[PDB]
Amino acid sequence: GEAPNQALLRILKETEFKKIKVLGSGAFGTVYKGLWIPEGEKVKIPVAIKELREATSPKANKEILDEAYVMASVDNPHVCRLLGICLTSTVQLIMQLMPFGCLLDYVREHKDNIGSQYLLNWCVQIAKGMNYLEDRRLVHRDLAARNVLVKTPQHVKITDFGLAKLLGAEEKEYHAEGGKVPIKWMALESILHRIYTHQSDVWSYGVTVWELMTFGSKPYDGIPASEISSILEKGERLPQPPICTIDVYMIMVKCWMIDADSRPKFRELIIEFSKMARDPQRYLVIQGDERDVVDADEY
Ligand SMILES: *[C@@H](CC(=O)Nc1cc2c(Nc3ccc(F)c(Cl)c3)ncnc2cc1O[C@H]1CCOC1)CN(C)C
Q: What mutagenesis or variant effect is reported for residue 5 to A?
C-alpha cells in the first residue's frame, strides 16, 4: 500500500559538471565541491559531489544504487535530495551545494553570534526531517551535527544517506552484519547486537542536539570507543550543557534511555521544541542573547 514513486533520477555526462575543491574523503571515496553546467543550458549551478573508491564490487554497487534511489525519492523542506547521478565506472553522486555547509562547523564559528531562537528552530527542523523519514519507513543510522547542512541560518537540511536502509512491511528493525560505524553516536542496542530502529535514530538526535547546545564539543573527548558500551551500561552519559535549562537537557536524557520505546519519538520531539520555540529565552540561557550562477531551486 503505497502510491506511485513518480521521482526523477537524473543521469549526467561527466562533462556537464566540474569538480573544484575537496571537502572529505575516507574509505568510501571522496566528496568534491564543484559546479554543474547543464547540457545545452548556459547556466552555472553550485553542487557537491561524492565519488566512490571502487568501480566493480557487486554489493557495493548495490549499496550506492540504493542510496541514490532514497535521495531521489525524498521531498521535504528539511531533507536534501539527489540532483542526479553520474554512472561512470567509479560512480558519482551529484547533490545540491549547501553554501554555509555542515551545521557542526557553523556553530564552532558563529557561536558568539549564535542565539536561542535559532538553536530551537533548528532542532524543530531536524525533528521534522527525521519524523518525515520515519513517515516513509526510512532509517538513517548516521545522524550527527556533521550530517546536517545549512542552506540558510534559518533553515537546515539532512544529508548523507550512506548508512540508510529502508524497512519492509512487518519489519520494524534492521540487523547489520559488520561495517565501519560512528560508535559515540548510535544506540547501545546497536553496539552489542547490531540492531537499528527509528528509536535508535532518536538517541543520536540526542547526541546531535547535545553537540548543538555545547557549540561543537567532541562527545566522549579523549575517551575511546572500546568501552563506550561498558560506560553506558554503568549509566554515565554526556553532561548537561551549561546554557541548557533542565527542561531541554531532560529530553537528551530521555533519548539516552537504555530502553528503546522509552525514548521520545520524533513526532513528540517536534512539539517539545515547537513549544520551547515560542518562548526560547525561558528554555535556553545565552548571555548576550538579543545581539551567471543559479541556486538550482527552480526545477
Ligand atoms: C562539515 C563540512 C562539510 O563537509 N560541509 C559540506 C557538505 C556538503 C554536502 N555533503 C554530502 C555528504 C554526502 C553525500 F553523499 C553528498 Cl552527495 C553530499 N553536500 C552538499 N554540500 C555540502 C556543503 C558543505 O559545506 C560547504 C562549505 C564549504 O564548501 C562546502 C565537517 N565534516 C566533514 C566533519
A: Abolishes phosphorylation
Pick the CATH number of 98-291 from 3.40.190.290, 1.10.510.10, 3.40.50.300, 2.60.40.1930: 1.10.510.10
CA 197 to centroid of ligand 1, rounded, Å: 25
**Runs of H (alpha helix) within the chain:** 58-73, 103-110, 116-135, 188-192, 198-214, 228-234, 246-254, 266-278
Alpha carbon distance 116, 127 (integer Å): 17
Architecture of domain 1-97: 2-Layer Sandwich (3.30)
Distance (angstroms) between ligand 1 centre and the Cα of 229 equals 30
Q: Are 99 and 151 in contact (CB under 8 A)?
A: yes
Where in the chain are all domains bearing CATH 1.10.510.10? 98-291
Q: Measuring from each residue's beta carbon to the nearest atom of ligand 1, which residues come in under 6 Å?
A: 23-24, 31, 33, 48, 50, 93, 95, 97-98, 101-102, 104-105, 146, 149, 159-160
Expressed in Å, this structure's resolution amounts to 3.2
Q: Please choose, from the candidates 70, 90, 89, the residue with its C-alpha nearest in 3D space to the C-alpha of residue 80.
A: 70
Cβ distance 88 to 56 under 8 Å?
A: no
Query: How far from 43 is each of 34, 85, 108, 278, 296, CA to CA, in Å?
Result: 14, 18, 34, 41, 10
How crowded is the C-beta side of 25, counted as CA atoms within 13 Å?
9
Distance CA 103, CA 159 (A): 11
Which phi and psi angles does 96 have, rounded to 5°? -70, 130
Catalytic entry in 75, 135, 142, 297: 142
C-alpha angle with apex 295: 165 to 142, nearest 5 degrees?
A: 20
